[PDB]
Amino acid sequence: MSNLPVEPEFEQAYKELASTLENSTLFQKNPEYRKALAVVSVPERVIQFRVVWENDKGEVQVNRGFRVQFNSALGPYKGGLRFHPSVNLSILKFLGFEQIFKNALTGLNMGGGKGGSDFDPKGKSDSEIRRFCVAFMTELCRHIGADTDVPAGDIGVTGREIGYLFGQYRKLRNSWEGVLTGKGGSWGGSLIRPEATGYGVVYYVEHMIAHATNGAESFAGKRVAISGSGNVAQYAALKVIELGGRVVSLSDSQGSLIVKDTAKDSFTPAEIDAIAALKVDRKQIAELVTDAAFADKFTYLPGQRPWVHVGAVDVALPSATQNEVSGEEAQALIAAGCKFIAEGSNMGCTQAAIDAFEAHREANKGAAAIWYAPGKAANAGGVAVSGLEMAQNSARLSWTAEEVDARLKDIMKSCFQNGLDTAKEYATPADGILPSLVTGSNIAGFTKVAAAMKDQGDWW
Amino acid sequence: MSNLPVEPEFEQAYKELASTLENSTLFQKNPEYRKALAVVSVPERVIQFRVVWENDKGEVQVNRGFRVQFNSALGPYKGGLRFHPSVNLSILKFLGFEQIFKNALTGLNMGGGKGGSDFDPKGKSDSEIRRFCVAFMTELCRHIGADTDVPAGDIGVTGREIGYLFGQYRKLRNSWEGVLTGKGGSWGGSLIRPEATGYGVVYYVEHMIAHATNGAESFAGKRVAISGSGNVAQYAALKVIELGGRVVSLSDSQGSLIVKDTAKDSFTPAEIDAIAALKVDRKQIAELVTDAAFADKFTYLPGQRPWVHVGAVDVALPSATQNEVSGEEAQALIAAGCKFIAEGSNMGCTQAAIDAFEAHREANKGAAAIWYAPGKAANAGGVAVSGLEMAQNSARLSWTAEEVDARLKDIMKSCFQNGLDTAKEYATPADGILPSLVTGSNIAGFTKVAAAMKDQGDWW
Amino acid sequence: MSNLPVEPEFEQAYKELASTLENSTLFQKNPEYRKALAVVSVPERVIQFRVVWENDKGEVQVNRGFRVQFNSALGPYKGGLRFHPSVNLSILKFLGFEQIFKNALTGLNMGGGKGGSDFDPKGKSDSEIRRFCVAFMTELCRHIGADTDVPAGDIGVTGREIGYLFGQYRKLRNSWEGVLTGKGGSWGGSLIRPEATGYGVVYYVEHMIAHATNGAESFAGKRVAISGSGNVAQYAALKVIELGGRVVSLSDSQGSLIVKDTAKDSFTPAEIDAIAALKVDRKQIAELVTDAAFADKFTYLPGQRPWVHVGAVDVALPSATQNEVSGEEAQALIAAGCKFIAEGSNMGCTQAAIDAFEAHREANKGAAAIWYAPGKAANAGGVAVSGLEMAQNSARLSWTAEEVDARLKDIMKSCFQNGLDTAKEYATPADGILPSLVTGSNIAGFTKVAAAMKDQGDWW
Amino acid sequence: MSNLPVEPEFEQAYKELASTLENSTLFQKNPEYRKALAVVSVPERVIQFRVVWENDKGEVQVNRGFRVQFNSALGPYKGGLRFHPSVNLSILKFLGFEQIFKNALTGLNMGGGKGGSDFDPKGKSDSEIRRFCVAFMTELCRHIGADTDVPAGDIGVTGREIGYLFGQYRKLRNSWEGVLTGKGGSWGGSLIRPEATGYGVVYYVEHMIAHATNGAESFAGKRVAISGSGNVAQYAALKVIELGGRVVSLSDSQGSLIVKDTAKDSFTPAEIDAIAALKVDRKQIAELVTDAAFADKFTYLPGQRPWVHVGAVDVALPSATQNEVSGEEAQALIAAGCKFIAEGSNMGCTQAAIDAFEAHREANKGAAAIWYAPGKAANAGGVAVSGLEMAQNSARLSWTAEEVDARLKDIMKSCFQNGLDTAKEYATPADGILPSLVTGSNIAGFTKVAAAMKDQGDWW
Ligand SMILES: Nc1ncnc2c1ncn2[C@@H]1O[C@H](COP(=O)(O)OP(=O)(O)OC[C@H]2O[C@@H](O)[C@H](O)[C@@H]2O)[C@@H](O)[C@H]1OP(=O)(O)O
Ligand SMILES: Nc1ncnc2c1ncn2[C@@H]1O[C@H](COP(=O)(O)OP(=O)(O)OC[C@H]2O[C@@H](O)[C@H](O)[C@@H]2O)[C@@H](O)[C@H]1OP(=O)(O)O
Ligand SMILES: Nc1ncnc2c1ncn2[C@@H]1O[C@H](COP(=O)(O)OP(=O)(O)OC[C@H]2O[C@@H](O)[C@H](O)[C@@H]2O)[C@@H](O)[C@H]1OP(=O)(O)O
Ligand SMILES: Nc1ncnc2c1ncn2[C@@H]1O[C@H](COP(=O)(O)OP(=O)(O)OC[C@H]2O[C@@H](O)[C@H](O)[C@@H]2O)[C@@H](O)[C@H]1OP(=O)(O)O
């Protein structure tokens, strides 16, 4: 197959999944699942399209649009849209492939997809973003729908963009339906959806801590290093603070902002809100680092990730982008006494990082190990609450915050227990060793999908 | 109308419904309902289509496909698919006609339909069945949909076939929706659906026994003769056993299997499971009769139905196919002390059988009479649970087994009460005589449809 | 296959076609065509539907509607609609099947179909026909279209009904297209379409006469017995007359009208016009009995067909309905010196008639033989000109009468030549024996369809 | 833009086009066409999809499907399907991009597209090819249509595959329309379409010879080296022979077959027909090279292209695949006295080859130069006759071979004159130098498209 193009991010995600499936008894019990893997890893459909749009000077601009409709055995295609200058097919295929198995772990009927554009929101006006969204949806519209494919946000796609997108879909298709999630509260949105992805990461990690320490420890007083400062990072940070943990770092594409006293100090909700308001306006953390409220409390490090700069730390939540924890950063976190690392970002750890965490787990009993959880497990609360938003739209009713948050909590608990239990069944660790959450989540997500595909005649 | 073709099964079903309407005060109170009967008896739509498919030898095969969309006043068309070499339009019209009034009895918004093919699954490989299902759905897809017509299983169509059909519908229409019921648990199925049809028959007969005996008797200690060994028979048998009854017979298309000691012995759940496994693989009961688990406990009667061979018996549940209880067999059951017979199978009793049971009811007070219930009442739990699978799919959530089962029980109790009360109203029996469940069920289903049709301007 | 219903008309048409293929070298050269025969003989799609409509007294009325979409390898389904109380699936299948092969002989891309209803236009008012057509098209519209299936008239369906049908399609679908043919001149009709079917029968027979006599005789001076008095009969009669022939009979469903002097007299165009006016009004030829201008010239025979009553005749054009020339009538025509018989009506001759004509052909050298042509050859001029109507509508232009007629003539000549040549090739007659136009037409049409089906993967 | 994947074939085609536009006065006259170039070079739409299909052993197989819908300003998307193991997005984008401008040069309303799969027909049975085509069209169907996108053949896609494709489209969409071209003669094909692509190459070269030699020379007695042995090569070879030229070579993916006497000998039509019959059966030229009819007349060279092996030659027609004339092969052809080289294959010459030809042209007056014509000009007769097939299907009529061939001839003449004249206007050569057909064809195709795009608001 030397005709196939090289897609490094997709191949990375595929290879890690495949390796975890091989390092188990799955293919001894079900060798025919190798056929399922070969089939599932070729997307059902991909749409690529030109997006021509007008800037504020009246000039023609051209960007590339995509929607990867990876798998639909379990439900309509489901997953976000990414507007970022790196975007290409390789990146969206990694994301879409991940999404299949992430969605499977929620328990809801959602197939996997992802899309977006190489349009860069940075440096654009709201008007330019509006015109781009209008043009983007003009083509995307014909390929999506409440029972076909339901997008949502991701990097570069917030409730603002989902609004422009929805309005254009409505205008084109003359239908008001759950074609997108992450919608506004008066026009079919769900309470808790803004909070859901980062809340879920934290909810998942609570279970990891409970399990590893037999209930002795929690987030109370733990030091948590977070990266990113967007939707996932913001609400992860807020949930950590609400549970009495201390957030010692955030970051953006230009640098890291770290409390000067990492043993005892934390970001506050007010500080997070200030950062969030910069981010609505597509500005950098660097802008506020000399204000009174920040200069004395924090150190800003241009060009650096937080991991080697936070001193001793208990929990790490990479929450920005793929491949943002290197192997060396992983070794630093281990040496700093970090015991829990969960991907808020999809494929947030490099392979070298994962290997370092999983070798540590295998070498250190119980609470002495660093325990690594993959994004398909930890990030799944976002998509789950999107599924609940679809359910609300279908019912034509709106649920309470308490009702949605309660379901979110149950879904994350189930997702942890499924990964744990599946790893115990198929990749039983040595006595006193924590089961691999990455292996278990991968096997659990995959076998659900492979079996539904078999039932539906996708492979035989 | 000598241009119309002779359609024996349909005419039989029509004539028995009509006769029961005539033998009542319905047409005295609402003589205009004769117009309704003339309209409702001509199907809204029927689609017939060639199905070309490839066998394992690479050879072209041809079969006939059908979908009868009989009536949609009360909801989208709803009803199963039959793959059996007998299939023709006459058979499918009888079935779809029955389905109108059966569905009306559930309380849910489901119109009447039925479809299938003369493709015979016996002697075919799973691969052959998969190719057949793919080709069948390639044409059927354009006629069905979650809000238009929702098929499901019946003779020769199980969850396996539903899977292949669903998978092809999704590939063709690029939509994941509740277009079929009987789906798999991970891809939109309902708990209790496998059990529902047989469980419902037995739930219905519980109310019959309770009423006729003023609560003195139940299924506990009763001897129950069942025919068939498929989905409806298997779970009717299992529920009888759970309730403390003894199942003395099952049968298939080649013979009956009867316990040697029909006074005291019963099939067990493990024996039912073994027969069920054979039926998944499309093999016959005959294969077992050698196994010492069976040879000493049971007698195999090839070419024979169970009714004359079970000795004294208390309940009969024909659960195979139409016209499987003859007049002679009805007299034998009456002579054998049988006091309850409900159709698990559609039109299970011949007209001569029904006429014997109803004459017996009219001549024998109370618990002395054999009480006959028609399939549109007793078999309604299966389609009812499919309406609930549709409800679950529309809500994008999955209910518990207890929730589905509780609803099933309530639906069967209401169906029984409606038939009873409607017979008391329109065909009031002599003092001490059990009301006619067949007349009552017929009137109750028919009036509901007729009135909805009038409201909707289908007749005036 | 004893599940299949008995369909006598269909079985008759299928058996005659099959017998002529077997009585030839076709299956020695292409034995694999037996598979094509088995596949082609099962219709691709059949739609049947209830038609509820209101009569002039405000009363609900119910009829049955049908559209048989038999084969589409060569083009969109094409063929007429019949409104006649005899209508059922058997009859419309015989018609649609024949249409496949008729259409194949035109050289145009037209697949085979036929439809209609058991609605009887006799005794109905024009308002009732309007209402019926409205209701009929309300369901038929979703199954038809300019590139899908293009109906037209037949028994009981004239330009009047085509108008009501077209208007309703336009109102429902909001499209103006060539969905029907036989349309009116100002709204997409074609010149020569009214005349085409009956003209084409006569044009076809001119070639048979030319061939039988090397051009020395023609219709000039010939005595021609016609049956029926509708669209086909009227224009066949008029063309005969134009060519210098004498039409000695016409007939309707109640009896025959025969010139008293069949050796020398003829219907005139004015007489045919008076008959045509009766038929527009759904009245019978029997009325003409009270008119001395008719009674002086003609004999009216209630309950009789013309064939045994015309004395010596040269050509017979059955032009009413199927199976209107019996074996005994065939023998009488032979004994009366008839040398040409062509079906204006589909399956106009009974099988006993066909066998008599074909035995005579085989036994009598040259112009001593009676020469029989089947409907699929001789009636093909109507559908041909409909294909030209479709061509005009797609062009968005209207052709002259001379242009259409010229094309019609070329089509009929090519049709005749194809049957003659294909018989010489596959069923070569003895020296001096006329080739079988029924065998040749059947092979020619069948091979064209079977080969196109093979190319398209309908069989292999 | 380092996010964009490397697509070598697409970049090669783009860069050559762009370079010819820069090496002219086009962007002095119309500098705003630079914006047009940036827009046009991003495809309007691309669809990629998984194709699962079954082999003759009943095994699941997976291939990748594509349709590049590049530009539609001038018409529906139009262009072939390639089934070859090299296929990927890069290759189909080169082809699709080329197609835009090729189609523009025909004068017909056809936008540019191309598609296909990495399915390899070699080693497959006809049945496997049938099943693959069925699966491929099952997804492709929803993206194409007679007024949206009309595919056809290319490498690995002949009339056989177009048949399976069409039959499945018809079955899915229930429409008979010009959704594909290269169809069979009885089911909407065009006479001359099989011959068109290679005939057109030769017709184009006739004009080149006429022009360069002021009418003194023709193909009569010229020695013509051809590569490939499929549809393009076969009919190019036949037209050369018909015009009295001598075909000294053909080739396939395994080797070249060259006459031993290249000064005086030639392939014959009979020999070409034998090669064509091998190629229908997916066999190699190597199979016949030792038969009596070939061993003595020809030399077979495994692993070699013909160019350096034919001795002195007058005309070269690469007719197999992209990049099949290297720079060294080009220098050899020049040294062998070759004066005309036209691409039957898309992008058949490497860049080094083109540069060698165009430097020779610029260095040598008139008939002393090797004159190079690009595939978008020389190969355009294939697509042109496809456009005529669309026109016939739209008209619902079939044209004569003479009528189609006459239009083909006029289109190729116009295409040569447009390239010639446009090169004279925008890239005027020095006195006595032949104008660049590659530059002129590129500018002519591009400006037509860019201006239609501007008119339609695609750029401004
Ligand atoms: N290539 C990159 N290199 C370094 N940092 C990156 C890169 N791309 C993004 N980020 C940061 O991550 C944050 C992204 O925030 P949002 O755009 O609001 O995205 P969201 O929070 O929804 O998603 C973050 C992660 O969570 C997953 O759901 C998603 O696929 C992704 O892996 C920002 O602080 C964003 O930085 P900034 O605020 O734009 O400077
Ligand atoms: N013509 C016939 N004569 C005698 N027995 C028949 C005939 N057709 C079928 N059966 C039997 O009935 C049973 C059918 O099982 P299933 O295919 O699983 O169908 P299901 O249990 O869903 O339906 C049974 C009846 O319950 C209704 O729902 C349905 O329309 C039908 O009247 C099998 O034991 C089946 O026999 P076998 O398992 O295929 O040998
Ligand atoms: N079952 C029958 N027995 C005897 N005669 C019949 C029967 N059914 C119909 N006819 C007559 O045939 C003639 C039918 O005329 P149209 O309704 O105008 O039909 P058209 O002339 O288009 O068709 C005649 C034949 O030519 C074929 O195109 C078509 O399928 C049929 O086999 C009328 O004189 C009509 O008689 P009347 O005008 O309805 O009494
Ligand atoms: N990668 C390759 N390397 C060397 N030779 C190649 C390669 N791929 C193809 N060919 C040859 O070219 C010929 C292709 O014939 P057809 O499949 O019938 O394609 P067609 O003649 O329609 O197209 C030839 C050229 O003309 C253009 O229309 C088209 O895009 C392509 O550039 C065969 O002799 C084919 O070889 P073979 O008959 O399969 O061994």
Side-chain angles (χ1 to χ4, degrees), chain A residues 224-440:
Chain A
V224 185
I226 301 185
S227 60
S229 39
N231 177 258
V232 181
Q234 287 161 24
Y235 289 97
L238 293 166
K239 179 54 68 178
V240 163
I241 295 162
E242 181 187 356
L243 290 172
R246 296 190 294 281
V247 177
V248 300
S249 67
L250 296 171
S251 74
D252 73 7
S253 62
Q254 283 184 23
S256 297
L257 191 62
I258 296 177
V259 293
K260 295 180 189 302
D261 179 5
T262 69
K264 307 198 305 306
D265 214 346
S266 183
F267 285 85
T268 62
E271 293 159 353
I272 292 158
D273 296 339
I275 289 167
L278 283 169
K279 265 66 182 64
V280 163
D281 294 340
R282 307 177 293 279
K283 291 170 176 168
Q284 310 301 330
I285 288 174
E287 278 198 19
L288 50 62
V289 300
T290 65
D291 299 353
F294 288 88
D296 295 332
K297 180 176 171 177
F298 301 97
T299 300
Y300 182 62
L301 310 177
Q304 293 292 304
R305 293 176 183 167
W307 312 122
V308 309
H309 302 290
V310 290
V313 77
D314 306 312
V315 179
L317 301 179
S319 300
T321 189
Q322 56 274 11
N323 288 324
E324 63 169 319
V325 188
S326 68
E328 279 185 18
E329 289 154 3
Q331 293 294 351
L333 283 172
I334 285 170
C338 189
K339 290 299 179 237
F340 302 92
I341 175 160
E343 288 176 356
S345 52
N346 290 292
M347 193 164 71
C349 294
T350 60
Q351 193 63 45
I354 293 163
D355 292 341
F357 307 134
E358 286 287 275
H360 197 274
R361 182 180 55 72
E362 285 184 334
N364 297 273
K365 304 186 174 189
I370 191 167
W371 208 6
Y372 162 70
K376 75 172 57 62
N379 175 271
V383 75
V385 175
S386 281
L388 301 184
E389 185 177 337
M390 294 167 64
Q392 292 166 76
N393 294 171
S394 295
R396 305 185 194 267
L397 300 164
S398 299
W399 301 350
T400 69
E402 291 191 357
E403 282 167 339
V404 175
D405 196 27
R407 286 178 178 268
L408 171 61
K409 288 167 158 137
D410 285 349
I411 285 163
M412 297 319 293
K413 185 170 192 201
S414 303
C415 171
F416 170 84
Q417 193 73 45
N418 190 13
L420 191 78
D421 288 351
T422 301
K424 289 166 77 185
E425 177 175 7
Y426 291 94
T428 309
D431 180 70
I433 299 295
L434 294 165
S436 182
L437 293 172
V438 61
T439 296

Side-chain angles (χ1 to χ4, degrees), chain D residues 86-150:
Chain D
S86 62
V87 164
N88 58 35
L89 182 59
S90 176
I91 288 166
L92 299 174
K93 285 181 58 181
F94 114 70
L95 291 160
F97 182 72
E98 278 291 306
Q99 210 64 29
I100 304 168
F101 304 111
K102 181 195 303 181
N103 288 5
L105 286 169
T106 70
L108 297 174
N109 289 110
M110 301 184 302
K114 205 91 181 195
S117 181
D118 55 13
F119 175 82
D120 183 3
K122 288 197 190 303
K124 312 289 188 297
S125 72
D126 271 15
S127 53
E128 286 168 338
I129 292 169
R130 168 178 48 82
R131 303 192 204 93
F132 176 76
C133 291
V134 167
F136 183 85
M137 183 56 82
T138 292
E139 177 58 26
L140 185 59
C141 171
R142 71 182 91 254
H143 311 285
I144 68 173
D147 297 316
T148 293
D149 185 358
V150 178

